[PDB]
């Protein structure tokens, strides 16, 4: 029926809103001080973008950003939440005496009906690697409620990618896969599945953090402007790159992170997940190459990162990279929904 049900398998949706129905998982995000405090500073320092304005909070979870919008003097805030967390948000709105200002509206933002158009939309719709969950598309879908010349918080998003070297990591994954090389596991030959195993293990994006010295070139930026993008712009995301290699070594894959900017009338406030910044619950993401590329300082590593949306609220990622000076090419798939959470 809805734009959401059309693009989403039910099995994905149930599991997804299940996860966000746990107070523990809302608390997980809330306790990211860099996340939650940057959102509050973006909202409070741009008070005039909220004062006496009508606001839509897309996926309000606990209500936390709706509270900041209220703290900033919003006249009315529509807080939309599709999980059962909606019920807990209404309890907090009553207990904080904000029944006059915050109106929880349970359901998917694609399916609910709002009483009026809004001056500004706030959300925190960023998955790991920015695009996981496809919630950016719910955020963009919500502009059907936005007044002309209305604002988005966050306003833009920058994906950064850079090449890295990490033989320890590479070897970690390679070794897991090599279980399936054994010709006599309890007397059974598994070796026929070695190829399928390496494929599966290297499909997995690695979520953790790293020292910036592992980066072999300055990062490439790809920007999504939320005021101007439409939903369909996120169906197929093509990110071409050309890297000027600053260090010689093996390139074991690409590292990804993202920043979002809240472009307000008073000031712009950045929320960064970069490895040069304080760590967030998004960490950073690395896509490993099954076959590493050797490159020399001054070479160019060029190619395309292609993200193709799927029905499981995520993306089919293909990364094709080549060292221009040798025609050494690496083609890679990555199943963004099946990550290896490596952080400790």
């Amino acid at each position: 029926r809805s734009v959401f049900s059309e693009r989403t398998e039910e099995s994905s949706a149930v599991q997804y809103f299940q996860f966000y129905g746990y107070l523990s998982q809302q608390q997980n995000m809330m306790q990211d001080y860099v996340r939650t405090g940057t959102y509050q500073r973006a909202i409070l320092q741009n008070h005039t973008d909220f004062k006496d304005k009508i606001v839509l909070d897309v996926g309000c979870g606990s209500g936390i950003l709706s509270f900041f919008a209220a703290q900033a003097g919003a006249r009315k805030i529509y807080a939309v939440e599709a999980s059962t967390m909606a019920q807990h948000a209404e309890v907090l709105v009553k207990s904080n005496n904000l029944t006059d200002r915050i109106v929880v509206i349970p359901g998917k933002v694609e399916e609910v009906s709002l009483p009026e158009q809004v001056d500004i939309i706030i959300s925190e719709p960023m998955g790991y690697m920015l695009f996981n969950e496809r919630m950016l598309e719910s955020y963009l879908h919500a502009k059907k409620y936005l007044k002309p010349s209305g604002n988005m918080f966050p306003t833009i998003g920058d994906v950064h990618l850079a090449p890295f070297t990490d033989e320890q990591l590479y070897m970690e994954q390679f070794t897991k896969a090599n279980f399936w090389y054994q010709p006599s596991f309890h007397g059974v030959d598994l070796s026929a599945l070695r190829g399928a195993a390496v494929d599966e293990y290297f499909r997995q994006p690695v979520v953790d953090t790293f020292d910036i010295r592992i980066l072999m070139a300055k990062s490439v930026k790809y920007t999504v402007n939320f005021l101007e993008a439409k939903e369909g712009d996120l169906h197929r995301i093509e990110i071409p790159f050309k890297f000027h290699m600053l260090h010689s070594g093996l390139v074991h894959g690409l590292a990804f992170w993202f920043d979002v900017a809240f472009i307000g009338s008073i000031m712009t406030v950045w929320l960064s997940t970069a490895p040069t910044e304080p760590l967030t619950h998004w960490y950073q993401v690395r896509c490993l190459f099954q076959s590493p590329l050797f490159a020399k300082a001054g070479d160019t590593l060029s190619g395309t990162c292609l993200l193709i949306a799927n029905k499981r609220q995520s993306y089919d990622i293909s990364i094709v990279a080549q060292v221009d000076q040798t025609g050494s090419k690496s083609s890679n798939l990555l199943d963004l929904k099946n990550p290896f959470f490596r952080y400790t």
């Binding site: 996860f19 979520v207 619950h281 929904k337 952080y343």
Partner: peptide
């Protein structure tokens, strides 16, 4: 369910 990673503490 492989959605948001744990906040670092």
């Amino acid at each position: 369910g492989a959605i948001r990673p744990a906040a670092p503490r």
